Structure 1
């Protein structure tokens, strides 16, 4: 079987807000599979979210990022008048600094050709043939990606912090996100096990599927 694609990520700042963290901007320690899937769709310029259902992603943390809080005068739709003072609320947002990670992309379970792995490989092969809009980012639109590149299993040849699907794990990362409410959001429990493993273990793979 074709070897899974490996991407090296380096984002100076990230915000993977929690699904239930609406009063305060609490962030996940590791990018959720849904956020990575959306980033890959943006990378290949695919607006439809159901197009690449079935792709399996594995995330390996190259280092533990530090969590910091920043104040922000975030806006909201509370009053009909745009200039009303009620539309601006001060709230904290937790960010992660100097995030480096390796992403494994495996597209065996996709039923629509070309697969996401092939699309990413073709986009990296001929960047001038990619038809997309906006700037690539991970998390919030202002959190641009510093380095995204094709890498091998030993890019830093160091020790890797894998995200393992453990039913007793701490983190509850979503692989599908409902941006309106929380009905269609689907969750999975993960843990961060320190494993130099270059390759992902079997439990480190998460398949992105529709909530149906």
Structure 2
């Protein structure tokens, strides 16, 4: 069964502020499967979100990042007039610094060819052929990625912190995000377990599906 594609991630600053945290930019410790899936779609230049349902993603967290709070005069749609001071609101947003993680992509469950794994591979062998827009980022648009490269299981030859689906875990990461409200958002309960393996344990293969 073809070896799943592995990507090495290194983002200086990132924030995956949780859903129900709309008053505060408080973030998940780990990139959620939905955000990673969206970033992979951006890398392969896939605007449609339903194109690559079924791809299984597993995240290995190389180093636990530090959580820091920053202030931002974020703009909101409260008043019809743009210049009205009610739009600008000062609030805190948490960020994760020096995030290094490895991503496993298993696109065997995809029913549409070419699969996401093939698209990512072909993108990496021939960067000039792939046509897309924007700048690759994880989380917020201004949080660019320092390094995303094809890597093996031995790239750090170290000890890995995996995200494992546990029904009694702490983190509640969403694998499908409903941006308008919260109807279609689907959550899974995870945990961070420190294990010395170069391959993900079964559960880690968080498999993205449509909310239906």
TM-score range, shorter chain: over 0.9
- Kindly report which structure 2 residues correspond to 1:66-145, keeping only aligned pairs within 5 A, or say none: 66-145=66-145
Match of 2:59 in 1: 59
Give the superposition deviation at 1:106: 0.3
Give the superposition deviation at 1:203: 1.0
Give the superposition deviation at 1:40: 0.1
* C-alpha distance in structure 2 between counterparts of 1:198 and 1:74, whole Å: 41
Give the superposition deviation at 1:196: 1.8
* C-alpha distance in structure 2 between counterparts of 1:99 and 1:181, whole Å: 28
Match of 2:195 in 1: 195
* C-alpha distance in structure 1 between counterparts of 2:28 and 2:132, whole Å: 27
Deviation sequence 1:58-89 (CA, Å, 0-9, x none)? 00000000000000000000000000000000
Which aligned segments of 4 or more residues in structure 1 are displaced greater than 2 angstroms? none
Let me know the Cα RMSD of the aligned residues: 0.3
* C-alpha distance in structure 2 between counterparts of 1:161 and 1:78, whole Å: 41
- The alignment's TM-score, normalised by the length of structure 1, stands at 1.00
* C-alpha distance in structure 1 between counterparts of 2:159 and 2:129, whole Å: 36
* C-alpha distance in structure 2 between counterparts of 1:118 and 1:35, whole Å: 20
* C-alpha distance in structure 2 between counterparts of 1:132 and 1:196, whole Å: 37
Deviation sequence 1:81-113 (CA, Å, 0-9, x none)? 000000000000000000000000000100000
Give the superposition deviation at 1:45: 0.1
- Structure 1 gap ranges (5+): none
* C-alpha distance in structure 2 between counterparts of 1:145 and 1:153, whole Å: 20
